[PDB]
Amino acid sequence: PMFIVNTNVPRASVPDGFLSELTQQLAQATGKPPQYIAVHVVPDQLMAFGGSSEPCALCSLHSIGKIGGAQNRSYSKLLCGLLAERLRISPDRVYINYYDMNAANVGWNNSTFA
Amino acid sequence: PMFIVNTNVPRASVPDGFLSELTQQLAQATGKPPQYIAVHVVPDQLMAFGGSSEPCALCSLHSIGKIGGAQNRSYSKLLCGLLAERLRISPDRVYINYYDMNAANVGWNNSTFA
Amino acid sequence: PMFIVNTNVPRASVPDGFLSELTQQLAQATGKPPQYIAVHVVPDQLMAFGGSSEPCALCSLHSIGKIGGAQNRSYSKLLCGLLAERLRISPDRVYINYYDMNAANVGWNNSTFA
Ligand SMILES: *C(=S)NCc1ccc(NS(C)(=O)=O)cc1
Ligand SMILES: *C(=S)NCc1ccc(NS(C)(=O)=O)cc1
Ligand SMILES: *C(=S)NCc1ccc(NS(C)(=O)=O)cc1
């Protein structure tokens, strides 16, 4: 799993431990060990959501499997909750794109997961 | 609809009002209320296009529907026109990737659009 | 072809000529002329891989064709080799997502490619 968050909130507002929390909670939610999980947080971005530059986030979760209707609803509850409590972003100003990757289309360590 | 533009032109060359314009233009182009549109502009990037570091852009447009052959041709003229007029980027130094998302694969407000 | 690298390596550790090298190597590997290739390198990112913030990279290779099981394994060796040598990133801390784009979903120069 790979989780990316782009946000307009300032870097100084990202709390200590946030990357680790995303890693831990994504391991719990996807069932993949933390060693398999990558996270990327991009603050200070020029962004608007609904025509407003109030705090917002655009995110993506890529995963080899573990993507689907009910799973994605659960991930959205989890991830919006973290963005609200940690980054102060209202859940109605977050989009998350979910991508189910074929293992042959994910490279790692001089090979792919096919 | 979510529109992202990454460019090597400097931040100071992004005009005041650009995010608002992108929101309004995309609302009209997709026929959707502006409350649904998210935009993200990333200047000052380390980029090359065709081996050259002259002004360029790499963009993406994600939407649940409203993506397809004819629509994408229209979006490309609109978006290249905005990048040319507002950021002085030649249309032949712009790539835009168009992504049609399933509703179940887009999270928002603690759930998904499914 | 469009190649994007996101990394926590600092900007000063990205060697001069890296974008040109990526362009030339991708031209050889994909068979497309350099004129067709775009590259984007994003240093200084806030990232973790397996819960650790040692040097890592999350990358994408989009291409109209030239994507598949065997090709992607070859690209991963090429790209992990370059990231290891040029950015000093361990290859087990690199993920690369491969995307085969339909030409009708790629905009350029005021229209699409199909
Ligand atoms: C998130 S995208 N992690 C990468 C990853 C690597 C391997 C697997 N398992 S396998 C080899 O496909 O069975 C899952 C996720
Ligand atoms: C851009 S990605 N905006 C979000 C959004 C939400 C819904 C829809 N379409 S629908 C028919 O309501 O599912 C499109 C875009
Ligand atoms: C990488 S994604 N380069 C873009 C690109 C554009 C055109 C072509 N050829 S064609 C026959 O016009 O579609 C290949 C790659």
Domain ranges, ordered by start, for chain B? 1-114
Method in brief: X-ray
Residue A90 vs residues A57, A87, A94, C73: alpha-carbon distances, Å: 9, 9, 7, 41
Place of tokens 């005021």: C110
Could you tell me the resolution of this structure in angstroms?
Answer: 1.1
A64 labeled part of a ligand binding site: yes
Cβ B38 vs Cβ C28: under 8 Å: no
DSSP C86: H
Classify A1-114 by CATH class.
Answer: alpha beta
Using alpha carbons only, what angle is made at residue B49 by residues C47 and C94, rounded to the nearest 5 degrees? Answer: 25
C36 touches chain B (CB under 8 A): yes
A66 labeled part of a ligand binding site: no
**Ligand 3, from B49, B72, B95: best to mutate by most atoms within 8 Å of Cβ?**
B95
Place of tokens 């991009």: A42
Whether ligand 1 lies within 6 angstroms of the CB of A18 is answered as no
Residue B56 vs residues A8, B83, B87, C28, C39: alpha-carbon distances, Å: 23, 9, 9, 22, 10
Q: How many CB atoms lie within 10 A of CB A31?
A: 11
Cβ A47 vs Cβ A8: under 8 Å: yes
Q: Alpha carbon B62 to chain centroid distance?
A: 9
Q: Which residues line ligand 3 (CB under 6 A)?
A: C 1-2, 32, 36, 62-64, 103, 113
Compute the distance from residue C6 Cα to the ligand 3 centre, in Å.
23
Q: CA-to-CA distance for A58 and A93, rounded, in angstroms?
A: 8
| DSSP states along chain B | -EEEEEESS-GGGSPTTHHHHHHHHHHHHHT--GGG-EEEEE-S-EEEETTB-SS-EEEEEEESS--SHHHHHHHHHHHHHHHHHHH---GGGEEEEEEE--GGGEEETTEE--
